[PDB]
Ligand binder design. Structure first.
Ligand SMILES: O=c1[nH]c(=O)n([C@@H]2O[C@H](COP(=O)(O)O)[C@@H](O)[C@@H]2F)cc1CO
Ligand SMILES: O=c1[nH]c(=O)n([C@@H]2O[C@H](COP(=O)(O)O)[C@@H](O)[C@@H]2F)cc1CO
Lengths: 122, 124
């Protein structure tokens, strides 16, 4: 099962350590998948090849949002992870895109991310 | 007269709110700016996005919602104009910079004082 992970880079790398923890756990469950144009084209190729798109959506990021919008239109299963401890109110576009099944948005505490992913990936 | 959809950060931060108001004021000279909790916001916005002739986004302040709108817009094959200010000190997302094809999806770097003139040139 092919997995695509999204998290902020140019939006800010505040959560980089957490992203590595998520990716580490995702590798147990499946394959974790020129300038900026080449980045965009390669990422779109991988998004089209994914079975599940997982996004850590706590740090606001244009690229993460864009990946999620393309993923929806590519008919992908999506899991978004948001930390209320950030003090932020998550974007209405992401919270409102969720349907609770093929697009899920979960609030979580950092210490529990491994258990949440274990649950989601059954 | 085109139907227009404007994107700019809200929950990402409202740092550029006055500039967004200037952009919308100018867009209104050219066409109609189309503009249940978060679900209703998403659904109504997606209806307007499909109706829009041009999607205009100010992409300087990072925002999940603006990025999402742009991703959905690309998949709807909308004409898209993104406006970015390098004097902000930020580096624009590769996903937005790299999505540009120079015609249907354009990214223009600009200085804040010039936004009305730039919009004039695009909608001329
Ligand atoms: O070099 C890159 N290589 C790349 O794959 N991305 C993709 O876009 C999102 C970050 O978007 P952002 O925060 O940078 O806007 C990530 O989930 C994913 F990493 C972005 C950049 C730089 O933009
Ligand atoms: O109330 C809202 N009403 C709404 O239309 N949006 C749409 O999403 C983008 C901002 O995304 P964000 O920065 O908030 O993530 C805007 O271009 C556009 F405004 C967002 C929210 C709150 O999220």
């Amino acid at each position: 099962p092919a997995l695509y992970f999204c998290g902020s880079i140019r939006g800010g790398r505040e959560d980089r350590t957490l992203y590595e923890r998520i990716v580490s756990r995702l590798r147990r469950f499946g394959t974790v998948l020129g300038g900026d144009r080449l980045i965009h084209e390669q990422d779109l190729e991988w998004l089209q090849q994914a079975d599940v798109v997982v996004a850590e959506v706590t740090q606001p990021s244009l690229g993460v949002g864009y990946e999620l919008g393309r993923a929806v239109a590519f008919n992908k299963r999506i899991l978004c992870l948001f930390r209320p401890q950030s003090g932020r109110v998550l974007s209405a576009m992401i919270r409102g895109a969720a349907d609770g099944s093929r697009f899920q948005v979960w609030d979580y505490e950092e210490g529990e991310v491994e258990a949440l992913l274990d649950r989601y990936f059954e």
